[PDB]
């Protein structure tokens, strides 16, 4: 799906593309993302050669992302402390928690510029 995202870039976005993967199974989403990110990793290495100079991004955007990330980070870190000291458990509902922190990030994972 072609998309135009005004507030990634300062002048004009690029008319970017979006791959999307729906399914029942979160496991098959993990696998499909693995795949598609494999591909993009390879093609951006292969096109560091031609050097499409990848325009210069805004800052409000970056800090917006940054706070959204540094809440989830401390959440995960306290979860790990609880696991270390056997305070809560290591059985479950932690699994269902971490697989929502996962899902949080896999939606627009790696917009690529």
């Amino acid at each position: 799906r072609e998309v135009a995202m005004t507030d990634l870039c300062p002048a004009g976005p690029i008319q970017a593309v979006e791959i999307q993967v729906e399914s029942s199974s979160l496991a098959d989403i993990c696998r499909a993302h693995h795949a598609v990110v494999g591909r993009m990793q390879t093609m951006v290495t292969e096109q560091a050669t031609q050097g499409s100079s990848a325009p210069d991004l805004r800052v409000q955007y970056l800090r917006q992302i940054h706070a959204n990330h540094e809440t989830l980070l401390r959440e995960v870190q306290t979860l790990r402390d609880r696991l270390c000291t056997e305070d809560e458990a290591s059985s479950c509902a932690t699994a269902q928690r971490l697989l929502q922190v996962y899902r949080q990030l896999r939606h627009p994972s790696l917009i690529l510029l």
């Binding site: 693995h34 560091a48 970056l62 059985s91 479950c92 996962y102």
Partner: protein
């Protein structure tokens, strides 16, 4: 035959270091087997004093790993089920390993039992077929307490997979934070009226960010997305 040990590293994505080692050369013949000397044939060779016999049984045999949780009793039936009902001999050089000497269908079967939080524990069965595994679990669940929740583990224990998942997220979110930190460093990179205007020009806000730096970090991050997708499939089956 010739025996060839290949080694391939996983960290380095250049596929650089794929070693190999020719570790030997195995001869067999029917004249050798007819004198025993390499066979494993049950009961007369019960008392295992060459450990290669044990590793052969642990390689050939069907392996299944169960987790046991009693949520409302305790778990001390297991050593008893193993030593009395199954009449197991522990191996001396490896005391985590019990060998069944109950002379019927279970003979040969090998267990291990690793206990953790005396409610929880884990059982591993090496059986020669899968009906013997079913038989063993019939006998077990007939002995245990009433609310006990067996669970066959395909890809490791949930306690291990929760750590392997939480590491892979606190690596990734650190990397996605490093993005903004290294960015912020780049973003950083009449007389009184004159000084005021000069310091304004100094503090003219850097609204823009180097794309190529962002790119380096998006690859740095993509490798960690990959690690976590693996770690999540391993835990979302379970």
């Amino acid at each position: 035959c010739t025996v060839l040990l290949q080694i391939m590293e996983r960290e380095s994505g250049n596929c650089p270091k794929d070693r190999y080692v020719v570790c030997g050369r195995v001869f067999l013949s029917l004249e050798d087997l007819s004198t025993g000397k390499y066979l494993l044939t049950f009961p007369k060779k019960k008392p295992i004093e060459h450990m290669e016999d044990l590793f052969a049984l642990l390689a050939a045999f069907h392996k299944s790993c169960f987790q046991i949780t009693s949520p409302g009793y305790a778990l001390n039936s297991m050593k008893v089920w193993l030593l009395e009902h199954m009449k197991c001999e522990i191996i001396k050089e490896f005391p985590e390993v019990y060998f069944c000497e109950r002379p019927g269908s279970f003979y040969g079967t090998l267990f291990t039992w690793k206990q953790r939080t005396p409610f929880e524990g884990i059982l591993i069965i090496y059986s020669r077929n899968q009906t013997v595994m079913f038989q063993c679990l019939h006998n077990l669940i007939r002995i245990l307490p009433i609310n006990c929740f067996l669970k066959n583990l395909k890809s490791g224990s949930e306690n291990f997979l929760i750590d392997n998942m939480a590491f892979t997220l606190e690596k990734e979110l650190v990397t996605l934070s490093s993005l903004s930190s290294a960015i912020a460093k780049h973003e950083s990179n009449p007389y009184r009226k004159e000084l005021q205007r000069e310091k304004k020009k100094m503090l003219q806000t850097n609204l823009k960010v180097s794309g190529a730096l962002y790119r380096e970090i998006t690859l740095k991050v993509a490798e960690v997305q990959l690690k976590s997708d693996f770690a999540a499939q391993k835990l979302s089956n379970l």
